[PDB]
Amino acid sequence: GGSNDFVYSIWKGPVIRAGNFALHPEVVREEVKDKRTLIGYGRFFISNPDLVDRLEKGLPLNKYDRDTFYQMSAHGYIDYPTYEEALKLGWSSFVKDFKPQALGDTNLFKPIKIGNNELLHRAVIPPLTRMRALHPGNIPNRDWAVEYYTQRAQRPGTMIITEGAFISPQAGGYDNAPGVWSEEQMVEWTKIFNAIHEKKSFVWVQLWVLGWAAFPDNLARDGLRYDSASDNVFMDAEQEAKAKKANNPQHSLTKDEIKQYIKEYVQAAKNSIAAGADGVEIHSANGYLLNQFLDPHSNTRTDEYGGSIENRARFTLEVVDALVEAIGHEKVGLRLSPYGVFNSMSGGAETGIVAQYAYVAGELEKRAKAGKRLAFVHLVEPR
Numbered sequence: 080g081g082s083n084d085f086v087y088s089i090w091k092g093p094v095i096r097a098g099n100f101a102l103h104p105e106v107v108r109e110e111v112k113d114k115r116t117l118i119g120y121g122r123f124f125i126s127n128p129d130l131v132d133r134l135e136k137g138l139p140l141n142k143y144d145r146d147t148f149y150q151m152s153a154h155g156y157i158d159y160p161t162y163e164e165a166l167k168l169g170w171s172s173f174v175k176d177f178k179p180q181a182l183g184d185t186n187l188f189k190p191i192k193i194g195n196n197e198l199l200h201r202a203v204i205p206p207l208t209r210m211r212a213l214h215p216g217n218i219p220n221r222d223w224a225v226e227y228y229t230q231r232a233q234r235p236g237t238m239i240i241t242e243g244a245f246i247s248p249q250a251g252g253y254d255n256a257p258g259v260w261s262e263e264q265m266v267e268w269t270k271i272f273n274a275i276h277e278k279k280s281f282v283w284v285q286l287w288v289l290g291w292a293a294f295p296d297n298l299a300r301d302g303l304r305y306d307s308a309s310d311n312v313f314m315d316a317e318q319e320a321k322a323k324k325a326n327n328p329q330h331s332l333t334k335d336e337i338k339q340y341i342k343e344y345v346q347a348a349k350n351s352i353a354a355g356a357d358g359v360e361i362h363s364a365n366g367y368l369l370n371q372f373l374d375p376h377s378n379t380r381t382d383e384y385g386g387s388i389e390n391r392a393r394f395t396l397e398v399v400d401a402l403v404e405a406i407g408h409e410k411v412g413l414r415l416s417p418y419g420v421f422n423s424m425s426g427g428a429e430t431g432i433v434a435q436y437a438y439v440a441g442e443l444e445k446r447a448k449a450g451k452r453l454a455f456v457h458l459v460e461p462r
């Protein structure tokens with residue numbers, strides 16, 4: 080037992096929800112009755128570039144391939160057929176033992192304004208790491224990336240949240256994930272954003288910082304710290320081992336280094352806007368750096384950034400306030416995963432985990448009531 084419904088009693092703005100919604104249209108039908116609820120479809124947007132149409136008319140869906148999720152290939156990336164295409168090649172089978180359902184009559188296809196963007200429907204593309212950025216440089220794929228996003232900007236007025244983008248090398252750790260700090264990166268993102276906009280759709284860049292989820296050896300190779308909230312608690316056995324082997328132990332961030340991250344958040348945010356992005360999403364979920372500060376298991380600090388609910392939320396909120404001041408509140412979003420245990424988070428097992436995120440939602444609303452409301456709040460559903 081555990082629901083994200085508590086957020087609605089606190090935060091009074093747009094809410095994006097994602098997690099196992101594609102194969103459960105009866106759940107979606109109930110949830111979208113709330114006039115400010117949007118739905119994110121992850122794995123099946125990968126397999127269905129025309130997913131928005133298949134949801135409106137209740138069409139069968141293509142199966143997805145887990146093996147080609149993070150593979151450096153066009154296969155399982157840009158070679159997923161639309162429904163009109165899949166028919167011409169046969170069928171011959173789609174998703175097995177599934178009864179589709181038309182949702183074109185529900186609020187899922189009623190327009191709504193998110194930030195500056197006039198969405199025509201509420202089926203959102205959540206951030207989806209595909210690990211196809213070029214190494215070295217963390218550069219967006221020059222061969223397939225533009226076509227990949229183009230296929231999924233198919234339906235006009237579609238909100239798209241990009242794969243997690245590193246705000247800086249220090250925030251990185253994955254060689255095949257795109258960054259958002261350098262020029263040659265922005266040259267590629269500019270093409271991507273243009274292709275999206277030419278399909279009358281919108282694109283939001285997720286600002287990503289790994290934390291203890293980063294590969295310690297990759298950071299040691301580049302003379303970078305393997306940092307997190309604390310230094311006495313680790314993600315798992317492998318990560319602690321790889322940290323000692325590369326002689327790059329887990330580093331507890333100092334206040335100055337925290338300020339440095341914020342500065343990198345700002346620069347990355349302005350880089351995205353300058354490149355022509357509609358807005359940015361602050362990734363504060365799924366066990367990465369900001370979540371590592373939020374979660375009491377990963378945060379054993381005794382200073383201003385730990386020891387309490389208010390302190391553990393300071394980093395996230397400071398990043399929010401910084402980006403709001405930098406590019407405006409109408410271009411800033413925030414993703415949370417209250418019940419998530421991914422990357423060694425506490426989840427519902429921590430009895431005070433709801434209070435922790437209730438506080439964050441409250442602080443967002445206080446800023447909203449004071450005249451600075453974020454574009455949306457992105458929530459990862461319990462599982």
Ligand SMILES: Cc1cc2nc3c(=O)[nH]c(=O)nc-3n(C[C@H](O)[C@H](O)[C@H](O)COP(=O)(O)O)c2cc1C
Pocket residue numbers: 097098099100101119120121122123148205206207208209242243285362365414459
């Ligand atoms: C291959 C893959 C990559 C993902 N990458 C990200 C990511 O980079 N950032 C993020 O916030 N969520 C990421 N997610 C989680 C999705 O945003 C979404 O929550 C997840 O797909 C569950 O929704 P679903 O049931 O529709 O698949 C990823 C999920 C998958 C399957």
Ligand SMILES: O=Cc1ccc(O)cc1
Pocket residue numbers: 208243364365
């Ligand atoms: O941010 C969450 C996330 C989940 C799975 C991934 O592969 C990458 C990121």
